[PDB]
Design a protein around this ligand. Structure first.
Ligand code: HEM
Ligand code: HEM
Lengths: 377, 105, 49, 48, 75, 58, 111
């Protein structure tokens, strides 16, 4: 009674208690709550960090050290933030992938909002990494921000507008801080709308068939399975932060910023490495950033190239192989992205980039058509 | 009719078996993606097929849940695979196409 | 003003919920104690110092 | 460089022992509730 | 939206269930369990495995050429 | 052991949500004392920087 | 939800007045039913098969009289509180609650 009628409870009830859900969803549906979890864990350790961090160049790095040595338990808080960012990205990558494989993208609004959610956390995380004002924080801030200067007749002014100076100076750090604080709240409102559009149809499932014929209430079933699910997120996260705090950050970004150095290194954090590879594969200022962008906004083209008469990939062998070649190709891309632009690495980084686009834009839709034909559809 | 046709038919039988909806006792039309044309075809089915269509989807979602599959004998055999939806779907499409032609003049 | 709740039955209600309410408060008590340790409220019994 | 080193690894020991104890338990909690569904039978009885 | 009781129309399907306190959460877990994981792996290898080894190979080759290139004999 | 330990755990302590809550919280205390120390103890199979061992020398 | 609501309420907080109503409803059901040679005859035959005696109305009265609230909340608890039910459904049952939920309504977290 009370759960069903009360204005606030309704919402909870309709989203986590009596929500009819397919009795069929597998582990790949857990990344939904996991991102939700990652989002909160990242706001909570993030706030406690802001209680000791200062966004001024001369104390920026020092305040981060202040946290790890002097602030009680500052270190875990710091590393949980650091690693949660990668954990947020692995989950983000599972989630997008899951939808791609299962045809979940046929829910345009939900999906499109998802792309806005992907961009928002990327912009968010990119600003996050600059905050400690480390060698990579500054040069990654430099290299990446400077891309916008490829935009014709507007670009120079644009880069100088967001920079605050003529470089990545004082204005940029405080600036980047403010947006890094405001972004995750906006992300939240958007995730609510993500969930708002999703609730309008309920979840998809591995068969892509349709589950009105067999729904189970979200409660014992998926609350308890999300719990067990969050527990494994914690394990991965904690295993990362306690045993190997600097593993995914790599031993490097320590030593303060130096606007005159330029380390023979320069590469964004791992989650941009595939995009990074695509960009440098193209000899051309404009084209590089054009293809950089296209490598992510292409998710907004996927539903227009569905092509198959079935929604999921569960019953489609050729498509499976092509999907796996996409993921395989995305490893190559990050791997290349994490290496210098010399002999072997250029040409495969070039080839793999063409493949990425050939796969999604031509090979996958073709396989769908072939698949339809083999089934006489 | 001969060598080549059977080869194409064998490629088709192979794909069918690989696609594995058979393994969950599903029939090909039970896997169709539900857009409006199809939503309407489903609607138009007679009582019997509709009911059989629901039991199969149900049987399959059940299997799909415990990630199991049916014993080989109960897999649906290719071309014993009644394409019950086809004629309805075709007619529904034919009706929409007619609406569309009228909307151009 | 607000006392339609007086009577045999209401009295009876109250007594059926006493063992429960008492037990519940003890939960929270032990809960608060254990949560902030034996200085910030309630020291004693087999636990160190 | 890393003063927290020791303690880090101490919590880690506790984290492995706890996860190693919570993980099985949360699993048995989950399969217990999902058992109504995993063990479950269907029959289809259409009119003759 | 959507609720329960307004989902769809279903006819003549019985469903027997048994209470969770009367069955085991881990019946033939190793017995029936493991063969299943082997069967699932069989069904999927040929579609998952190959793309990856193609990268696995591209990776080790890619590195060898790189390392071996920053060396040289005459000229 | 005999008419079951769990049976008694249920009958005397788990039939009510009160006692249930109550034991979990009482059980939470001791567990902490036992484990926190237990894990600190097991950790002592590294008689190295063992602050206690150094305390004696200097 | 309402059905189960009453079982627990009775398991935990049954009150005296309603118990008298019950007792009285039962005194009337008993006496009202043994009206006519047929029901009485049926009653003699059945009783001897199950009780080995014929239980005189005076005894059933004594047995009813002894029941107070404490008994009700003690006897209901023994059979209802946190026990698994046997559920059976037929018809448009899309919204019949999942077993676990029905099972979880057989006990209550307040208590
Ligand atoms: C509004 C909530 C958030 C607050 C208040 C916040 C706060 C902070 C602060 C103060 C820092 C600098 C201290 C440090 O580097 O440890 C930081 C760094 C960072 N932030 Fe956040 N953050 C929030 C959300 C997020 C989100 C959602 C992400 C995306 C995963 C993110 C990713 C990062 C990364 C990658 C770093 C640098 C890693 C490091 O050096 O530890 N933050 N954040
Ligand atoms: C802030 C980051 C995000 C959050 C909090 C979030 C949240 C969720 C949640 C909770 C679900 C529930 C279904 C499930 O458990 O999988 C879901 C499903 C879904 N999400 Fe997201 N998501 C995020 C990012 C994304 C992005 C990057 C995409 C893809 C562009 C996306 C697209 C989708 C789609 C299409 C579904 C439907 C899945 C299905 O029914 O099979 N979301 N999302």
């Amino acid at each position: 009674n009370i759960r069903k009628s009360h204005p606030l409870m309704k919402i909870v009830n309709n989203a986590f208690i009596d929500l009819p859900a397919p009795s069929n969803i597998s582990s790949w549906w857990n990344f939904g709550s996991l991102l939700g979890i990652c989002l909160i864990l990242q706001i909570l350790t993030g706030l406690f960090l802001a209680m000791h961090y200062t966004s001024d160049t001369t104390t920026a790095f020092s305040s981060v050290t202040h946290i790890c040595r002097d602030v009680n338990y500052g270190w875990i808080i710091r590393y949980m933030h650091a690693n949660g960012a990668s954990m947020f990205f692995i989950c983000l990558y599972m989630h997008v992938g899951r939808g791609l494989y299962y045809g979940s993208y046929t829910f345009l609004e939900t999906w499109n909002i998802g792309v806005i959610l992907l961009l928002t956390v990327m912009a968010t995380a990119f600003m996050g990494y600059v905050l400690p004002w480390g060698q990579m924080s500054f040069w990654g801030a430099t290299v990446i921000t400077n891309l916008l200067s490829a935009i014709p007749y507007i670009g120079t002014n644009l880069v100088e507008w967001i920079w605050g100076g003529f470089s990545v100076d004082k204005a940029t750090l405080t600036r980047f801080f403010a947006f890094h604080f405001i972004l995750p709240f906006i992300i939240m409102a958007i995730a609510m709308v993500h969930l708002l559009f999703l609730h309008e149809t309920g979840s998809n499932n591995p068969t892509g068939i349709s589950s009105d014929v067999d729904k189970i209430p979200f409660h014992p079933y998926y609350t308890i399975k999300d719990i067990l699910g969050a527990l494994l997120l914690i394990l991965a996260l904690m295993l990362l932060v306690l045993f190997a705090p600097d593993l995914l950050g790599d031993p490097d970004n320590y030593t303060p910023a130096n606007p005159l150095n330029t380390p023979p290194h320069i590469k964004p954090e791992w989650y941009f490495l595939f995009a990074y590879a695509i960009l440098r594969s193209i000899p051309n200022k404009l084209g590089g950033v054009l293809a950089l962008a296209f490598s992510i906004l292409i998710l907004a083209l996927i539903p227009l190239l569905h092509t198959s008469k079935q929604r999921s990939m569960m019953f489609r062998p050729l498509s499976q192989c092509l999907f796996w070649a996409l993921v395989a190709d995305l490893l190559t891309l990050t791997w290349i992205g994490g290496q210098p632009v010399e002999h072997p690495y250029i040409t495969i980084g070039q080839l793999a980039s063409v493949l990425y686009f050939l796969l999604i834009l031509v090979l996958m839709p073709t396989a769908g058509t072939i698949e339809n034909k083999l089934l006489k559809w | 009719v001969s060598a080549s046709s059977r080869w194409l038919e064998g490629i088709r039988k192979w794909y069918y078996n690989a696609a594995g909806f058979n393994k969950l006792g599903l029939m090909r039309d039970d896997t169709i993606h539900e857009n409006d044309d199809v939503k309407e075809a489903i609607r138009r089915l007679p009582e019997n097929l509709y009911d059989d269509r629901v039991f199969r989807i149900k049987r399959a979602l059940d299997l799909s849940m415990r990630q199991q599959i049916l014993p080989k004998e109960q897999w649906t055999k290719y071309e014993e695979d009644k394409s019950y939806l086809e004629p309805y779907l075709k007619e529904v499409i034919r009706e929409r196409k007619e609406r569309e032609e009228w909307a151009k003049k | 003003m607000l006392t339609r709740f007086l009577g045999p039955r209401y009295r009876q209600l109250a007594r059926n919920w006493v063992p429960t309410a008492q037990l519940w408060g003890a939960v929270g008590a032990v809960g608060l104690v254990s949560a902030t340790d034996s200085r910030l409220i309630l020291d004693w019994v087999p636990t160190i110092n | 460089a890393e003063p927290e080193h020791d303690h880090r690894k101490r919590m880690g020991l506790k984290m492995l022992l706890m996860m190693g104890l919570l993980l099985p338990l949360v699993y048995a909690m989950k399969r217990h509730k999902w058992s109504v569904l995993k063990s479950r039978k269907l029959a289809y009885r259409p009119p003759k | 939206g959507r609720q329960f009781g307004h989902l769809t129309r279903v006819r003549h399907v019985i469903t027997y269930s048994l209470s969770p306190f009367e069955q085991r959460a881990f019946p033939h877990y190793f017995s029936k369990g493991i063969p299943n994981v082997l069967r699932r792996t069989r069904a999927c290898i040929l579609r998952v495995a190959p793309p990856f080894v193609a990268f696995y190979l591209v990776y080790t080759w890619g590195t060898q050429e790189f390392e071996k290139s920053k060396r040289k004999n005459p000229a | 052991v005999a008419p079951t330990l769990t049976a008694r755990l249920y009958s005397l302590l788990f039939r009510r949500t009160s006692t249930f809550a109550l034991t979990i919280v009482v059980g939470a205390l001791f567990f902490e004392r036992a484990f926190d120390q237990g894990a600190d103890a097991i950790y002592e199979h590294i008689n190295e920087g063992k602050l206690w061992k150094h305390i004696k020398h200097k | 939800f309402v059905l189960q609501g009453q079982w627990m309420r009775l398991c935990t907080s049954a009150t005296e007045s309603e118990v008298l109503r019950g007792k009285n409803l039962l005194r009337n059901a008993l006496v009202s039913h043994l009206d006519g040679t047929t029901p009485v005859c049926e009653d003699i035959g059945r009783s001897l098969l199950t009780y080995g005696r014929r239980i005189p109305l005076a005894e059933w009265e004594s047995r009813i009289a002894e029941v107070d609230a404490r008994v009700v909340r003690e006897v209901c608890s023994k059979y209802f509180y946190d026990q698994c039910p046997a559920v059976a459904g037929f018809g448009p049952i899309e919204q019949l609650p999942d077993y676990n939920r029905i099972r979880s309504g057989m006990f209550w977290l307040r208590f």
